Write a protein that binds this DNA or RNA. Structure first.
Ligand code: CL
Ligand code: CL
Ligand code: MG
Ligand code: MG
Ligand code: MG
Ligand code: MG
Ligand code: MG
Ligand code: MG
Ligand code: MG
Ligand code: NA
Ligand code: NA
Ligand code: NA
Ligand code: NA
Ligand code: SR
Ligand code: SR
Ligand code: SR
Ligand code: SR
Ligand code: SR
Ligand code: SR
Ligand code: SR
Lengths: 154, 186, 140, 160, 95
RNA sequence: CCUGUCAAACUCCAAACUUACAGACGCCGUUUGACGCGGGGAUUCCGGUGCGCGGGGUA
RNA sequence: AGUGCAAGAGCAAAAGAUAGCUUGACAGUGUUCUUCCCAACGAGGAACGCUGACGCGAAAGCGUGGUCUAGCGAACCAAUU
RNA sequence: UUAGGCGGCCACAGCGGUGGGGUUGCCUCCCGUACCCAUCCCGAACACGGAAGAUAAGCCCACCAGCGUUCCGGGGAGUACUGGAGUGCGCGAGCCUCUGGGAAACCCGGUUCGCCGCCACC
């Protein structure tokens, strides 16, 4: 399971690439979604590779982001362990995080919006003109690299 | 053979065994094919149908299995050819086949020949086959009369082994008589 | 093995390449059977622009007709090794061509499952000179 | 005519002589110099002139450089010296010039040039350890008459 | 294009690979398809008749009946539905 | 035999890629009716630039 | 090679050659595609049917002109069946 | 299939070569022209009639790789080329990095001297 965050805006990006992001439920910069590692999904992230940051987050990090940015399919009801327990097939955020990372369920299945609307990266990110290996923030990240980014955008 | 761009003919073409242009025209009918073939000593009739991995023979008769019904005579002649077609035809009727188109392969459409005798034989068995009566030898020749008269110009028996001296087209009648009959064990 | 390997005469082709015919008559007498007209191809400067038109005549003899002819024909020539083909043929002269071959030559002349004769069963100038020379005359 | 007009590969390959007429003759006198009756194998030293940039070289330049190169080898090793040099490229690319404004401008044929990718050997010489510095000097003169910068690379020759 | 005839720009698609040259096997020229069957359209260079417009080479239509021995194949050209008359010789079952 | 070079109107080879159809996933639609169909009203048929691929031309 | 003529393409028990026979270069009426990719537009063209009448072939079958893509013309008026 | 017929794929099947096989069996070569039929001339072929001989052709079985072909390994080569991205480099033609794909020639070693279907048959 990979966490996907759009880091580059829609202006001037190929339409078929913008549509791909929308099919992955991301319609804004800094919006994040969790995608199963399938051959079908793999082609999609590969196509959006130059306008996004992605990788597999750690259990803890996922839990931090879910607690802080997860939302109900509809409504403003805050999502905490109690919400999780009283609305999902899990006991608390941790149980959800584990099931997601192991690809057993999806935010939608559990009555949660497929998107995590993150905050701008505190302290800024590594730039959107170069990939990770070159010192930028675009492309596939380390579990640690992805964790660093997601946390800065908690 | 010569190089990368060299064009080798289809196998059945190299072997000089199948006229593909005639085959196509044959298959365009949608009907089964009464495959008439001949050897120096024997004659073969097959009812063939088209198939996924190749042709499908639904019924057949070889001049050899003629003795099986009382034939002590040679097998590379007119009476043989006719009766062979009739046997194959009869068996064809058995398996459900009702119509056919004559496929004489690489043989010539010579009037009165054996491939045409095979066809008259198959037709008499009740099979519907597009044909032309005036291209078939006349009844007597089919019976084997032409060979009787030849043995008339005797001085030395036409046949080596003794099946008879002046031969017998009447034997043709017996066998045909035996086939047209129901009892027969096809 | 030798029986189905010993050479034989397939055909004796006697022809007169003229160039415009009247000569048919003699060939008919010297050979014994009807001759055939010979047409030419391609236009020819030598007032031979007409494509299909009599220019020669030939006769193909087989079996007895062939030998009965060669009997009183070969004595008229002075056969030489050079005058022999690579297939075991030879012609002298009015032309007289002799086509020699082994038993099952038909394998390459029939309509069904025809096949080209293997270089082993093909006749040779050497085996050719012999057979012939082994019958009323001398070689070189 | 300046080379700036043709040195770049900014046009389709135009070589088909069945569709092109009036092609001027090449000014290249020879492609094989020195002792051509001998093999390059019979020599201890082999030095080539390598073009550093991809370019087109008009036949007029090939002849000037080759000439000034071989000319030196003749003056230093003799009109029969024990060496051999090869110009391995041929001017296949036909060039045009539109010599009436921009209307129907397809140019008339005016020459030929050889396309050379960077890193390729334009010339290659074979000599004896003695004349090694003479062949190197011939190339110094040759590359001064062709568009790109070149490398004088020494192939077989471990006599350093 | 310099001209607009039906065979304009068809050099490649209507030319046989050297070894596929010569009369084609009769089996596929006699093949029978059922209505509804998906069939790929591809003209056989060696077969003169029963062809469709070259522009449709590569389509994968649906047999929706026949006319004489030829088949009526349904396709969607861009956004427009068209019916193509074509003989088995230029058809192949899908999958 | 050896040795030196090529092709927009060459090809024994041969991509990336584009493309028909289908299944799967995704997204979307069945009160926001999608897809498709019929009808009313247009405007429009001087375009330009960057990037990629070009063709002409010294440019 | 040849296959009337550009070019590209097709063709070998043939689509080429020779021989013989024949007039389907036929009447009526359609389907579809093309013309005009997508996407509406005429004449013209092609492939594919049905009906009628025929030619050749043992027969399957082939023949809606020439192996395929150029060789074409509205309304009004006239002549013709 | 101890030799046959009709095929599908249409060279992995081609080219070339070696060895083996047939008394009433099979296929042939083979013998022979009264008939059906046949040759612009020839029973050569086509067609018909038939068994004295033969396994030399063909054919079938076993096999050989030199040429041609198919596929595979290792090398060439993740090279050549390339879809997506870049305030990376270069006076510039152009190049580079990241990401996703990925040859061809050729060399070397294997594979390939057909596979399969239906019918008939000591
Ligand atoms: Cl036969
Ligand atoms: Cl069409
Ligand atoms: Mg909400
Ligand atoms: Mg920055
Ligand atoms: Mg092209
Ligand atoms: Mg007027
Ligand atoms: Mg008039
Ligand atoms: Mg032997
Ligand atoms: Mg710069
Ligand atoms: Na004549
Ligand atoms: Na073909
Ligand atoms: Na029209
Ligand atoms: Na044998
Ligand atoms: Sr240019
Ligand atoms: Sr320079
Ligand atoms: Sr394209
Ligand atoms: Sr036609
Ligand atoms: Sr004979
Ligand atoms: Sr400059
Ligand atoms: Sr790969």
């Amino acid at each position: 399971m990979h966490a996907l965050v759009q880091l580059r805006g829609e202006v001037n990006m190929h339409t078929d690439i913008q549509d791909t992001l929308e099919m992955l439920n991301i319609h804004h910069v800094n919006h994040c979604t969790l995608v199963p590692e399938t051959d079908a999904y793999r082609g999609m992230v590969a196509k959006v590779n130059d306008f996004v940051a992605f990788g597999e987050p750690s259990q803890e990090t996922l839990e931090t982001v879910l607690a802080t940015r997860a939302e109900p399919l509809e409504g403003d009801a805050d999502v905490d362990d109690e919400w999780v327990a009283e609305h999902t097939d899990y006991d608390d955020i941790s149980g959800l995080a584990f099931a997601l990372l192991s690809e057993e369920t999806t935010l939608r299945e559990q009555g949660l919006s497929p998107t995590l609307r993150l905050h701008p990266p505190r302290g800024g990110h590594d730039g959107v003109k170069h990939p990770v290996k070159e010192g930028g923030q675009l492309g596939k990240h380390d579990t640690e690299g992805i964790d660093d980014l997601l946390e800065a955008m908690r | 053979a010569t190089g990368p761009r060299y064009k080798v003919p289809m196998r059945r073409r190299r072997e000089a065994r199948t006229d593909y242009h005639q085959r196509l025209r044959l298959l365009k009918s949608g009907k089964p094919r009464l495959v008439a073939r001949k050897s120096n000593k024997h004659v073969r009739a097959q009812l063939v149908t088209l198939g996924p991995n190749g042709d499908d023979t639904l019924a057949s008769a070889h001049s050899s299995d003629l003795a099986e019904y009382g034939w002590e005579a040679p097998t590379g002649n007119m009476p043989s050819a006719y009766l062979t077609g009739l046997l194959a035809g009869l068996r064809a009727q058995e398996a459900g086949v009702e119509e056919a188109v004559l496929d004489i392969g690489l043989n010539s459409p010579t009037p009165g020949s054996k491939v045409f005798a095979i066809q008259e034989g198959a037709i008499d068995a009740g099979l519907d086959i597009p044909h032309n009566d005036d291209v078939l030898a006349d009844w007597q020749r089919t019976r084997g009369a032409h060979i009787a008269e030849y043995d008339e110009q005797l001085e030395e028996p036409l046949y080596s082994g003794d099946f008879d001296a002046a031969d017998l087209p009447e034997h043709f009648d017996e066998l045909r008589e035996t086939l047209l009959d129901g009892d027969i064990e096809l | 093995f030798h029986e189905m390997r010993e050479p034989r005469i397939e055909k004796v082709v006697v022809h007169m390449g003229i160039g415009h015919a009247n000569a048919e008559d003699i060939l008919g007498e010297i050979t014994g059977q009807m001759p055939v007209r010979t047409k030419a191809k391609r236009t020819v400067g030598e007032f031979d622009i007409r494509e299909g038109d009599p220019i020669g005549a030939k006769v193909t003899l087989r079996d007895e007709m062939a030998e009965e002819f060669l009997q009183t024909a070969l004595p008229l020539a002075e056969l030489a090794t050079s005058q022999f083909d690579d297939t075991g043929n030879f012609s002298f002269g009015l032309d007289v061509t002799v086509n020699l071959v082994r038993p099952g030559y038909r394998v390459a002349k029939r309509d069904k499952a025809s096949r080209s004769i293997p270089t082993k069963h093909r006749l040779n100038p050497a085996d050719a000179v012999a057979f012939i020379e082994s019958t009323y005359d001398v070689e070189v | 005519k300046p080379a700036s007009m043709y040195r770049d590969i900014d046009k389709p390959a135009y070589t088909r002589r069945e569709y092109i007429t009036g092609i001027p003759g090449s000014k290249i006198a020879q492609h094989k110099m020195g002792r051509k009756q001998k093999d390059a194998d019979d020599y201890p030293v082999q030095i080539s002139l390598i073009v550093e940039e991809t370019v087109q070289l008009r036949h007029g330049s090939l002849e000037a450089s080759r000439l000034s190169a071989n000319r030196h080898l003749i003056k230093e090793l003799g009109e029969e010296g024990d060496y051999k040099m090869t110009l391995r490229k041929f001017p296949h690319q036909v060039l045009r010039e539109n010599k009436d404004g921009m209307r129907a401008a397809f140019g008339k044929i005016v020459g030929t040039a050889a396309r050379v990718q960077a890193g390729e050997q334009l010339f290659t010489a074979y000599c004896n350890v003695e004349d090694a510095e003479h062949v190197k000097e011939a190339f110094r003169r040759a590359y001064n008459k062709i568009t790109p910068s070149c490398r004088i690379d020494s192939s077989p020759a471990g006599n350093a | 294009p310099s001209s607009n005839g039906p065979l304009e720009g068809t050099r490649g698609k209507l030319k046989n690979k050297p070894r596929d040259r010569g009369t084609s096997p009769p089996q596929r020229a006699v093949e029978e398809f059922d209505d509804g069957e998906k069939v790929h359209l591809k003209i056989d260079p060696s077969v003169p008749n029963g062809r469709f417009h070259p522009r449709f080479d590569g389509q994968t239509g649906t047999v929706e009946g026949k006319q004489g021995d030829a088949y009526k194949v349904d396709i969607v050209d861009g956004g427009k539905e068209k019916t193509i008359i074509v003989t088995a010789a230029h058809l192949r079952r899908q999958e």
